[model samples]
Target chain A: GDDRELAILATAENLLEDRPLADISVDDLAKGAGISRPTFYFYFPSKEAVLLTLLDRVVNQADMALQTLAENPADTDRENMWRTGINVFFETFGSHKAVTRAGQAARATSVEVAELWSTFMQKWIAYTAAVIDAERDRGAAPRTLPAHELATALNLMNERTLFASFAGEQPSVPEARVLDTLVHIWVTSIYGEN
Target chain B: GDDRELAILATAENLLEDRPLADISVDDLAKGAGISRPTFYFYFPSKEAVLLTLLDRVVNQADMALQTLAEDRENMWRTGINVFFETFGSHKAVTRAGQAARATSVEVAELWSTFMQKWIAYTAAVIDAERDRGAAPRTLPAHELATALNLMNERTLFASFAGEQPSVPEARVLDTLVHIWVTSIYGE
Candidate 1:
């Protein structure tokens, strides 16, 4: 019963690897799923709907990662806790690179995609602030900048940097080096270490 | 002769205020400019070309501000940083649109990258000099760190202006950014 819906989602994921979400159409999606255009609507309202479903799946994994990281917050353990969450995020982004790019591309143009993207970013900010608040309460994180702003900016950095890298746009540096640079900044800012 | 080009460009910016670059077509652009589609092609290749012009037009203010700021190098110059944010922030609508288009359009992405590369280079040079004089650290390569910090500012400022994320005052955002810049490079 639900197998067809899952198949349709898989087809969209496969198609997205080789084409832009904008270039794709209902007809193409229907054809790719081995169904007619009318049949395609059986499971989804629009191609954006298909994408939102896929994004929701991946975003769920990412949110769970942050939720786990934020479970036990301590000043001494914050750096490693932050690293663990970030690694989980990068993995979630990498394994689902196609939907990640699709969600990012649609974020500005589509209401559903943008709203979901905002939801995920806000979740990250909430968890990040929780850790920062933990550290500051214990005199580890500095009070120089507000926790929420710092978290927002740091996550934005991750979003922008990773988006550029995964899109094949950031040509000069390798992904590992870029990830390391981000971790360095995160640790340094939160723990005041180089 | 140039007025037709200018009209088309103006129409594109006007259309862009309420729509994404992808939603605007060449025909709409032509009709808005009161010109034939072929005439639109004569003035510009496509809607993206018109948008590129608009982007370039807004980006020029940001470029000029950075050029002025680059005239004097300092270990910790808050004025240049403010100018950077103000110039970019003032044109938030245009830059935000370009950044959105960049996610889907390779041409737009390259244009965005070229602009960022120039911005990052100037910053890297300033930081390099600061490190040479023992003001900033040499732990991270100046250019690499400069690139990351520059990317951070661009993305963070966009998120801040969009107002979709949680509330954080714009002034604190900038100060936090500069603080990150100073601490990451100077270990302070």
Candidate 2:
């Protein structure tokens, strides 16, 4: 039943609050869903399959976040619109920090996950590149760098910076400065001023 | 003897020429070095250990790349002072191995992470120095900008070498990276 599938997914989200995916087991997932361990198998092949499903959900959230670019006020300046777009990513992705971290960690071992991650990033780059091209056409940004190159660099920076924050690495950017720093870099690099 | 270690290291570099790190096993390293598998352990605990030593050398060379900035150059890239690319480029096998393993292995990831920390610190200090001398405009905080730029290099280079499809072409990657560094730091 769809209810069983959703319960397993919810259980994963709840378990990630305290423990990493490595510490999570199939039995725990089955127990959380009020099903026998064998039934958990019927629902999904493995715990990683559950994680992949959650990761897919997170990507959809991020996709919606990226769409806010089109939802901006017609009078909004490029900087404000751009800031809104980046902030949505921080809010949406940050809400699922645990899943993002695990999904990134799984990229090295899981070919399917890696392929999905690659496709997601490529879509992000394409969307960003389109924005840059449009800004140039509208005379909002200078076209000093190629759109694809600029978009790739800017988006890669966003990925690494956010990944560092989500993973809770030592010596991460201060939370106060994270958004401002990223926005400044994006605006300056694209518009030639912050 | 040091010779055994050197042999093991050289054997790793050679084997990488034919296949990736995942394909080159400890036994192959032993065979390439003309030593027993147990003896290979004496030189390197695992194939990864050998790669780490090679990666260490690459980092040392990258440190030198950063130093090229201090020689009163007209520009960072114009003067042909990009030892980061040169070093990694020359040692592609080792660099690729480390980049790939960092995702799966904690120790490998930490090693690269430690290197990134130092690289960021050094670049941040240089940025602060430029701002102090009025040579570079103040934008984001020195460390934050440095963190982003340094990581951009890591990711770009990793993707380029990993053969990620639809990436920046090999010839243009360096110029593109140099442009971002100059523009982001100097506001060109």
Candidate 3:
């Protein structure tokens, strides 16, 4: 019963890889899914809707990675805890570059995409603050900047840096050092380590 | 000839206060300029071209403000960075709109993207000099660290101006930004 819905999503994901969301249309999505144009509406409201669903799925995995890292045994190295979460974001967003780029491009123009992107960023920020709060409570990390503000800036750094990298912006950060740089900043800024 | 261009820019800015770029049209610009539609084309290629001009002026002011910072590392956390936030903050509506437009406008993206590269280079050079003087330890590559920190500045400022919720209050923002910048670079 849900196969048609699954087919539509898979088709949209495949199409997005090769074309901008602007270039892909409802008919194309409907045709690729082997469903009628009317049938496509049953599962998704617009082409952006399909992209949002795809974006939601990837962000969930990224969010889960942060949660898992935070829930790890307290004895885990603080640097590793931060590194794992940061790396998962690069991997998840890196793996789904097309969908990520499309959503980011739409963010300014499409209200829905912008709202959803904001939701993801805020969720990650709150989750990171929770981790920092725990570390501070345990006296493992200092209380210089509020955990929430630090997390906000760090996550915003992740969002801007990763978005530029995937969007093919020039004078970009070297891909080789992005993880190391981010992990370093997150650790140093949050834990006061170099 | 330049006066008409200025009038067109003025009209666009005034119009933007009431409506988004999507709502403003070339005809509206022409009408606002008291010129024919074809005459509007003589001064600017498109509505977005006018917007890019508006955006460029604001950013040029921002660049000038940033260019005045001294090379001294000690004064960096306290004095200079606020210029960046304040200059852009004073022109928040123009910058916020340009930021939104950049996603769709290739020309807008190029303008800001190139400016970032320029800022990052200046920042990286400062960090490099600090490390060479043994004032700061080199952890990550200098340029990479500079890129990360400067990018953080870009996003944080944008988000703050955009009024993204759970926000850093305007008063505390400079302190928070300086703390991260200092701690990340010097482990202070």
Candidate 4:
């Protein structure tokens, strides 16, 4: 059977292209999809649900990409792995700007959205921690700091930098600068001089 | 003027003895001080201003005490300095509990409250950075990963551990744990 869910998601993407997610209504989404308002509601409870569903898709795709990267014999370089993972995250946000914005707005308003954000963060941390473990096994990284703490610090930096980049009214640095700063912090915190 | 401000502060402290600052109203403060409600506003704009005034007093006292400790050339050990500073902050919370509450609350109901909280945090970071510069001369502590960072973490933990001694033994143990943790991570 064809995935009717994809049609709903496509409709959302089209609606987002027309206007911001916060401004788009369920009726608009249904009209874009050529479905009834009830049909859209049957697929998603609210605008936030649609955003969360999009986030779920991106996270799952990222997870699969990470798994494939881990299995690839030619791409076993740790730095390449880190760069690829970060690039994938950046690409996901770049392609799904509206979904990312919606998720962030939802997080500021709803505890459920905050929980979803934290869940994704924990997944990212766990994935990075596994890479750290592998690097340590290969004698490429220090064993002094606990991998979990290091991963937590990385996640915290990522979140703080990302939020500072996007949310602040008068950010001292641009988003790319913030990303660069974060990459510096992450690398130094993990591998720099004591 | 004959230090009517001091009288108001004393009354505020007395009111704190019975109830928490959040529970105490402007009328209650004024009545406790034997003054009219309007007179209270004349001295301090809001409950937050009163709290800030109290915090300024406590910080000034701590600063003086720390200055005295710094002047004692024989007791210039880093551990001694850390212990003195940590102990002072730990005890000052009692007198400035209301101020600290307003400074750290996450309710975000008011814009000014949030601004004040951020201001206090930023000021604390600046002080920590200044101290780190003095301590290391050349090497600066990572502002985000140093004892200053730990202070924020400890504040959250302490809030959860309030009145629950089993969760965290005391300020001394906390100081020691923080010292060990900082040393282990920063190799200070």
List the candidate numbers ranked by lDDT, top first: 3, 2, 1, 4
Residue A3, candidate 3: alpha-carbon lDDT: 85
Write model 4 residue lDDT over B1-188, tens digit each, in one string: 33767777777767765666777898887887777889888888876666666655654554455456545211233443354346444544433364345324333224323433443344345436545656422233333333223332333233323432122233443343333233323332
TM-score of each: 0.85, 0.92, 0.92, 0.53
Stretches off by above 4 angstroms in model 2 are A71-74, B17-20, B68-74, B77-81, B103-106
Counting clashing residue pairs in each candidate, in order, gives: 0, 0, 0, 0
**Candidate 4, CAPRI quality class derived from DockQ:** incorrect
Of 1 and 2, which scores higher on lDDT?
Answer: 2
lDDT per residue as tens, model 2, B62-170: 7766676556422654333256766787887788777777766777778787877887887788788889999888878899888877777777766776667436655
Return the clash pairs for model 4, or none: none
Candidate 1 on A1-194: residue-level lDDT in tens? 48778878998998899988878899988887788899999889999899999999999988876666566553445556667777887778978888898888787668888888888788788878877887789887777677888888888888877766776665334466776777777877776632
Instruction: Calculate candidate 2's fnat.
Output: 0.38
Candidate 1: stretches off by over 4 Å: A23-37, A72-77, A171-173, B1-47, B72-77, B103-106, B166-168
The CA lDDT of each predicted structure is: 0.77, 0.79, 0.82, 0.54
Tens-digit lDDT track of model 4 for A4-46: 6687787787676656676788887778777888988788898
DockQ of 3: 0.58
Off by over 4 Å in 4: A1-7, A10-23, A74-80, A108-112, A166-169, B1-188
The lDDT leader among the candidates is 3
- The TM-score of candidate 1 is 0.85
Worst window of 10 by summed lDDT in candidate 2 chain A: A68-77
The window of 10 residues in a row where model 1 chain A has the poorest summed lDDT is A70-79
Q: Per-residue lDDT tens digits of candidate 3, residues B120-184? A: 88878888888899998877778888888888888888788878764566666777778778877
